[PDB]
Design a protein around this ligand. Sequence first.
Ligand SMILES: Nc1ncnc2c1ncn2[C@@H]1O[C@H](COP(=O)(O)OP(=O)(O)NP(=O)(O)O)[C@@H](O)[C@H]1O
Ligand SMILES: [Mg+2]
Length: 333
Amino acid sequence: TRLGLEDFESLKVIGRGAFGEVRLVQKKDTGHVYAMKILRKADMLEKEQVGHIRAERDILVEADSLWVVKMFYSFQDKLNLYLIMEFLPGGDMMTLLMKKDTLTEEETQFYIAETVLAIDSIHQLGFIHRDIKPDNLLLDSKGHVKLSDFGLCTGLKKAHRTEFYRNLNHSLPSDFTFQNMNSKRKAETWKRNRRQLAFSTVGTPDYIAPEVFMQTGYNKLCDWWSLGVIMYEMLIGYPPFCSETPQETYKKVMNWKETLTFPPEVPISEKAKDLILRFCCEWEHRIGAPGVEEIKSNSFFEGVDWEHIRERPAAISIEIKSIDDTSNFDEFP
Ligand SMILES: Nc1ncnc2c1ncn2[C@@H]1O[C@H](COP(=O)(O)OP(=O)(O)NP(=O)(O)O)[C@@H](O)[C@H]1O
Ligand SMILES: [Mg+2]
């Protein structure tokens, strides 16, 4: 009665995470195509926590947001967790940035605006996405944004945990060589190491708001900090605080007042710079604190409708030629 692995045929691996993989699959009796996310139980939190997260996830499924990938089934065996969801053939934003290097301000405006709406919708339903970054942003067949399935793997990467930095002081970094590289060279290093970073079970705090590592605690506004980091990366080519090691990156994040700068040779608008600085400041004055409308009325979103954006042409046309077209994903061996 309940569906299991045998009811599906794996067609191709289309994504890899630190703690599992995502496959394109075909439901045998129907021929319909789906994405199947597989997570290894041995990498997961304890069974009780996993069960409570899956239970609360069905609230999100029930709400059926435009802005979250549609999830149809979930099952498990002794090894793995499985989630069957709609296949979104536009690929993820990390891979898109890999192919384009940077986006125009108009392209950026579009993706950020849709992501503002996506993040706000999960916040309205009581969820904090504590891992906003380009590999966790998907594009559907019309090029519009959806959040991939989230919640189970939050904070599991070693470098995403406070404990990882225990005896490391918050003093300024020391990678003076790296720091004095031109922007183009920073961008190249970031790109060269990007995929490995996504698959790493260690990772970095490049996208994590500073208060997340503070004893003081944090709130839903941490997501807006992450979005700001993504916005900077879309325009400049790498997130503001990237380094050769997660330790330096952490030091750069904690010292954002000194380390968050725009390279002199890179073209970026005054509006874009201002918004990035409103996203990436201390949470008490961070844009969005009194409500999402403060974000939406930012001068950088000047042309944005915000009622009809998801119902109008997307910034970039997804070029696919079949419903099982995997050309917007990397190959996996
Ligand atoms: N529904 C989907 N349609 C198409 N590709 C997908 C889909 N879900 C995931 N992928 C691909 O697989 C990649 C990784 O899946 P992802 O959902 O991020 O799992 P994860 O990274 O292993 N765990 P998590 O920390 O929860 O994100 C994505 O960024 C895509 O490239
Ligand atoms: Mg992921």
